[PDB]
Structure 1
Amino acid sequence: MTETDKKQEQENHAECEDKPKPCCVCKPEKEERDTCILFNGQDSEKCKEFIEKYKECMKGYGFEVPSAN
């Protein structure tokens, strides 16, 4: 496990992403969710994936859904 991790794995040759990655968050999840809703989401059982995934995402971040009040 140590002598097999000493080397790299190589996922993609020549990088192309310069933007930072805060990890977890839900920045992209929000866009994808809204998109699905625009298509056929709303109440259909084809958008529950984005909704549930969004909830868990923010949960791991540090806050469960942005408070409005």
Structure 2
Amino acid sequence: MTETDKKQEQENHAECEDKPKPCCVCKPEKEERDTCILFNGQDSEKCKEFIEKYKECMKGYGFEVPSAN
């Protein structure tokens, strides 16, 4: 539970991975989507999985589709 966590950790001081992680977004699943498109999609039955995954992402993130990205 929360209190099981929030004391301190003291795992890593050297916070080398200067890479903020907003969560949701849709990076990998977009990349997978456009990759599926490129391979054998445009329309196809084989891309719908990634197209669906592409929306839930952004809906959750809080944008019902981007402007253009």
Q: Output the TM-score relative to the length of structure 2.
A: 0.66
- State the shift of 1:6 in Å: 11
Q: In structure 2, do the counterparts of structure 1 residues 20 and 3 end up closer, same or farther at CA, with 3 Å as the change threshold?
A: closer
Q: CA RMSD in A?
A: 4.1
Larger relative helix fraction:
2
Which stretch has the larger CA shift, 46-55 or 13-22? 13-22
Tell whether 2:29 aligns with 1:26.
no
Residue by residue, what CA displacement relative to the aligned partner does 1:7-45 show, whole Å, maximum 9, x if unpaired? 999999999976432111112221111000000011110
**Structure 2: 5+ residue stretches without partners:** none
Measured in 2, the distance between the counterparts of 1:20 and 1:52 equals: 26
Identity fraction in percent: 100
Instruction: Find the aligned partners of 1:23 and 1:44 in 2 and give their Cα distance.
Output: 29
For 2:10 and 2:38, the matched residues in 1 are separated by: 37
Q: How many pairs does the alignment contain?
A: 69
Q: Unaligned regions of 5+ residues in structure 1, if any?
A: none
